[PDB]
Write a protein that binds this ligand. Sequence first.
Ligand code: HEM
Ligand code: HEM
Ligand code: HBI
Ligand code: HBI
Ligand code: ARG
Ligand code: ARG
Lengths: 361, 361
Amino acid sequence: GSHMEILWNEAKAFIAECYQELGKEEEVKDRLDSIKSEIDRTGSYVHTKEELEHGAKMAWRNSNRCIGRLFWNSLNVIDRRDVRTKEDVRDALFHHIETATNNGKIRPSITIFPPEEKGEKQVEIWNHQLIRYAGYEGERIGDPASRSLTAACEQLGWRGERTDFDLLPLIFRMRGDEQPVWYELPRSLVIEVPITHPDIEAFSDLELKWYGVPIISDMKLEVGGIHYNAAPFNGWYMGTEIGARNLADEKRYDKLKKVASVIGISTNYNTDLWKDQALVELNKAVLYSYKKQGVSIVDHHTAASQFKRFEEQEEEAGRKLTGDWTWLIPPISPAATHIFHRSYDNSIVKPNYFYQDKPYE
Amino acid sequence: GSHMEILWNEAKAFIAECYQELGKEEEVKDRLDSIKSEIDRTGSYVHTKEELEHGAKMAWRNSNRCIGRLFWNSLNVIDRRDVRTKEDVRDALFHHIETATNNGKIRPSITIFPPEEKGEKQVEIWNHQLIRYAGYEGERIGDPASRSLTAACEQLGWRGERTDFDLLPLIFRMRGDEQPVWYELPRSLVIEVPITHPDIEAFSDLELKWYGVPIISDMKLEVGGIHYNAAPFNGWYMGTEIGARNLADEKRYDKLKKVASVIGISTNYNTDLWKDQALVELNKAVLYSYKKQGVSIVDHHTAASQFKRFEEQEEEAGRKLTGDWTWLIPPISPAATHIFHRSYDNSIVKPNYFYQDKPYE
Ligand code: HEM
Ligand code: HEM
Ligand SMILES: C[C@H](O)[C@H](O)C1=Nc2c(nc(N)[nH]c2=O)NC1
Ligand SMILES: C[C@H](O)[C@H](O)C1=Nc2c(nc(N)[nH]c2=O)NC1
Ligand SMILES: NC(=[NH2+])NCCC[C@H](N)C(=O)O
Ligand SMILES: NC(=[NH2+])NCCC[C@H](N)C(=O)O
């Protein structure tokens, strides 16, 4: 009763806004009549390729926490609403990885899977990111952030070699099944980059490496009232995410003290700012490495610079700019970018991407 | 009518809270009766030395934007509510600088001047900070942030030598006067620190220097409904304020490109992260310099560390912790401190320090 109401309201708002940007303002009337009857007949409606394709772009545009929004209208939308089997999902996910990686020249993409019907999911992705390292304990081994999921995967028959860089398998659940299925990722499909330094040879002794493409797979894409709980998307990495966070946080890989060792500085006094010097060399190492292997990556200054350009375009287009200051600023040298020196309206506008409760844990 | 009401309400709240922390809970009743009659008789009330002394500490404790709050109960409170002349104010300000500096071993202090009576100020301080460099234009000369005030001072007969480090004079206005008076600061009273690097000799070619003690002089101290528009206070510097902001911001001294030059790195590509490397060396230079001249200063890691300890004590004391995440995180390596990894309630609690409209501009 109330669900059929919210749906209709969100649909009217989205079609109008969408068709207005698409230059199909006259087609709004006839399109809404079709949707009204569809919601009554079934209890939901089916987007057109053009609608979800542009709704996925708009959602990216409204992602307050994303710094790379300047490239919103270039998103490669892959429609996989025709998937029925676990093999279809697996192949789609394999396809996403292959096409997004694009031999290094990363292509920002998103694979749309069937959305929820009567609130129930058709495809449920468990993975945070399609490619991600596992985490274990006795003493820290791997990525701590992957612990709860690594345990869940292991409760399904999967076993990691217990190195710091074990690739978690693809784990998802189809409607009608009680437990998710899993598939080990084909290594030929996964690009990893060993981390080295341009001027410091000893850096390779740290034996650090990271994967090339971050593919957030556990967020909900909401478009015109339709909940696409499964819509894996990807951009390329901003070096800081790997160097100033993934390999730096005490709760993650905690490598700063070790970096200080190989670069030849002491860790005795904070006044020497060894952590800061360590972060700069670790981050330079990351940028130099990806570039060297031919994998797309962006430094935080270029990214902020591109994001400034984004803000201007939104002003030029007549749209209100929204953002989360605390996430837009890079973890390293935030005051060196314009983002630090201004404020952002952190209001939620749809369509968008949202967090959803994890099936495990 | 309404002013006499707000005053009474704020007073009841403060005395109770104050006397509770002071262990003088029984004296609350008798103290409030005296205040009630005082407000009726005159239209305001006079704090006791103990009250404003502790109210100034509490206010510091509630300063969401201050990272050095762990040292709140050690604040050296100087009561100068007996000042009547411009000479009294001038001497008090000279005294504050002398006693706070303390030959380098900076002493966190605050000089309390007469508060507002019927909304009107008795002493109006124009200076943002007691010691501060001037700013000019044709091309940038000095500190851009001091421009509007430098122009105002010059409209009063003062003239700067137009170097990048001209000391602004003390400028304030007494009740009853239309224009403020000014007094050049005695150099013997002002500690400045030339900036040098421990490992890079050429750094001195930049000829950078900064003053030792930051003394915010334009904030309002509100305690139990009493508005002390003039209450200059000071702590010591956190290196980042000078190196990652005062000398780094494009709108301030903009020295990063020049720092890159003296340390021997190129400014050609963002991927080399030259700004970050530049910031680290500039910041190390700052810390090493103050320490070398015997002037108190604190690095951002020690400060965050001290602030963590602060949060714990507030939990142990039973008090709610409040803070502004965007100001607590240091401009350099914020993710390396605990402040980055948590959230803070940015609610305003009194007593406190507030911004007030600038007389100039
Ligand atoms: C093209 C390159 C892209 C760059 C450089 C970029 C960069 C970023 C960065 C640095 C963050 C912060 C990540 C973190 O701190 O964990 C972020 C978050 C986000 N980005 Fe992107 N992004 C890109 C593409 C995309 C795409 C293709 C989409 C969606 C269609 C998108 C959606 C989002 C969203 C929803 C967030 C928030 C994620 C979260 O809360 O965990 N971004 N992006
Ligand atoms: C003892 C050493 C102290 C340290 C290390 C310290 C540090 C800081 C830092 C780093 C900031 C940010 C400044 C900026 O970004 O411009 C700040 C702000 C502030 N501090 Fe402190 N502080 C100290 C003492 C004090 C004292 C003595 C008081 C007051 C009695 C105080 C009151 C405040 C207030 C109100 C702010 C906000 C200032 C503004 O908005 O411009 N702090 N403090
Ligand atoms: C919530 C979390 O603990 C923390 O407050 C924030 N995390 C992040 C952040 N910034 C980015 N980009 N990514 C984060 O994960 N700033 C704030
Ligand atoms: C308001 C200003 O432009 C900016 O948003 C903020 N300034 C400061 C900041 N942090 C500190 N400590 N000091 C600032 O001046 N972060 C945010
Ligand atoms: N640039 C991006 N597309 N980032 C998406 C999130 C990546 C995540 N912060 C990571 O380091 O794994
Ligand atoms: N540590 C302090 N007490 N800082 C107070 C403000 C100083 C100001 N940010 C400056 O650099 O001049």
